[PDB]
Amino acid sequence: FGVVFRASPRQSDVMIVAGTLTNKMAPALRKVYDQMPEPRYVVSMGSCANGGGYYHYSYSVVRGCDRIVPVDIYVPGCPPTAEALLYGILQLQKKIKREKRLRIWYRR
């Protein structure tokens, strides 16, 4: 589809937060996010990243990455099937296809 397997943080367009997010690991998540050159889209994959999943009530868990970054797509499942995630990506591409960046600019 065009989704290369591995891209460095500075060359990336979409972050995929696949897995749990413990408090200790939260600060580095944001630090990486802020370094993403725009436009930047965040995809939350799995139950532990949408809402803290199985470990929702644990003391050392962040209850969803949306507490730490603005998410664009939520892929549910523990874990989502590889095909379920692929649908999530193909969902984003349509979302990027409905933007009106120029039109909005043209009418300011």
Binding site: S47, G53, D66, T81, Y87
Partner: protein, 176 residues
């Protein structure tokens, strides 16, 4: 029992040594690895053309939770709160009252889908095959709130996938 995976003592006869010498100075082994890859270049790749094709599943597959109905139309859930008592992630919230006709039925039934772990214990526990995991696995949303299903969102899945949920159970309930 056991066996030594690396205990060889290469023979030091001239032919043997010349082989090792012939290997180093001419990259024979490295070539042999290139042969293997060159074969994969001429095999049909294992790629399925999704979405026009779908990776095979099985009738036991666990997907989006859904609420079923009897053939008549009545609801199957009777607010027995067993699914709520075993859901390991405590993602099921039930609140029931006697219905206007005296029946026992729920009023609140939310399955937070961000705490569910798709374990499948809910349907294993329901004594009336009410809450079942449909086979749908493509319902990723664009906001968090859309994943906080409430009873109205669960039935509609029931009234939307029953044409397949019913078929699967028929296929697999015998193993249960």
């Amino acid at each position: 029992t056991y066996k030594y995976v690396n205990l060889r003592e290469p023979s030091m006869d001239m032919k043997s040594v010349t082989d090792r010498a012939a290997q180093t100075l001419l990259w024979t082994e490295l070539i042999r690895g290139l042969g293997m890859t060159l074969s994969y270049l001429f095999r049909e790749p294992a790629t399925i053309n999704y979405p026009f094709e779908k990776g095979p599943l099985s009738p036991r597959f666990r997907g989006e939770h859904a609420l079923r109905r009897y053939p008549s139309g009545e609801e199957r859930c009777i607010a027995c709160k067993l699914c709520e008592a075993v859901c390991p992630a405590q993602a099921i919230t039930i609140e029931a009252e006697p219905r206007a006709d005296g029946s026992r039925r729920t009023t609140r039934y939310d399955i937070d889908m961000t705490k569910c772990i798709y374990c499948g214990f809910c349907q294993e526990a329901c004594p009336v095959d009410a809450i079942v995991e449909g086979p749908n696995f493509e319902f990723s949303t664009e906001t968090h709130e859309e994943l906080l299903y409430n009873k109205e969102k669960l039935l509609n899945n029931g009234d939307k996938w029953e044409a397949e949920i019913a078929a699967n159970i028929q296929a697999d309930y015998l193993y249960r």
